[PDB]
Design a protein around this nucleic acid. Structure first.
Length: 189
RNA sequence: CUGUCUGAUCAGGCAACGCCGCGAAGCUACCAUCUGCUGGAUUAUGGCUGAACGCCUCUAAGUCAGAAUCCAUGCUAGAACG
């Protein structure tokens, strides 16, 4: 409808410094550094003070304005991943065949190896994204821990694990086997 | 091997390739043998992050995987005015 101005406020906490130039966003915190490129969006940024940043769209229509909240949420995930971390938990679900999951290394590169899924002889390997750590949890039986600074990478790599274990040619309501994301939270609470 | 002709023998001619067995060479037969490649991008579909719409949502920005599909690799010709 061509709204004259739309604003969003980024709350940037005590231990972070969000550096922005030409829609390239670099968020430094106690757990490291995260970068995001936003050259595909027409937005502008204002430093209100050290603890707040204003994000603005001028003369935007409905969809251009819809992108504004998305921009703010993405940068906020950057901040909360550089200060609090991100941790996704996966549980192994099976009826008869135990799912054997190991973190192996080939070509000097880390992989997640899933064996005996529904008794299949095929072995499944999922490449581990950069900055994402996998860890077989010890407190809980049959649980995988996916952690990292980037919410996007951690969630995508957990989804890669969940999608590789789809059941074919069966009633999935009955054959409920798989590896599913059970908890989505933060490393430090 | 038959009939006939060269007097006989030897050696030959002819039968509008005379007839029969074998027959190399060459050609040839799923009637024989050999050989038929591996990268990227997608469709349907299933997802991630995520607004619009304080919630939600695979979608709007962004993004992942994925078909005998598509484009290459490979193969054939080589523009007779490249």
């Amino acid at each position: 409808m061509k709204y004259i101005q739309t604003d969003q406020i980024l709350d940037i906490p005590e231990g972070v410094t969000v550096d922005i130039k030409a829609r390239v966003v670099k968020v430094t915190g106690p757990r490291g550094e995260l970068t995001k490129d936003l050259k595909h969006i027409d937005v502008t940024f204002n430093k209100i003070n050290n603890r707040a940043i204003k994000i603005t769209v001028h003369n935007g229509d409905r969809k251009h304005v819809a992108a504004l909240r998305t921009v703010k949420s993405l940068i906020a995930n950057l901040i909360t991943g550089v200060t609090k971390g991100y941790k996704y938990k996966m549980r192994f679900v099976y009826a008869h065949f135990p799912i054997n999951v190991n973190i192996i290394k080939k070509d000097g590169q880390d992989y997640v190896e899933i064996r005996n899924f529904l008794g299949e002889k095929r072995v499944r390997e999922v490449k581990i994204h950069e900055g994402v750590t996998m860890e077989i949890s010890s407190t809980q039986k049959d649980e995988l821990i996916v952690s990292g600074n980037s919410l996007e990478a951690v969630s995508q790599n957990a989804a890669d694990i969940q999608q590789i274990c789809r059941v074919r040619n069966k009633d999935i309501r009955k054959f409920l086997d798989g590896i599913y994301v059970s908890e989505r939270g933060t490393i430090v609470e």
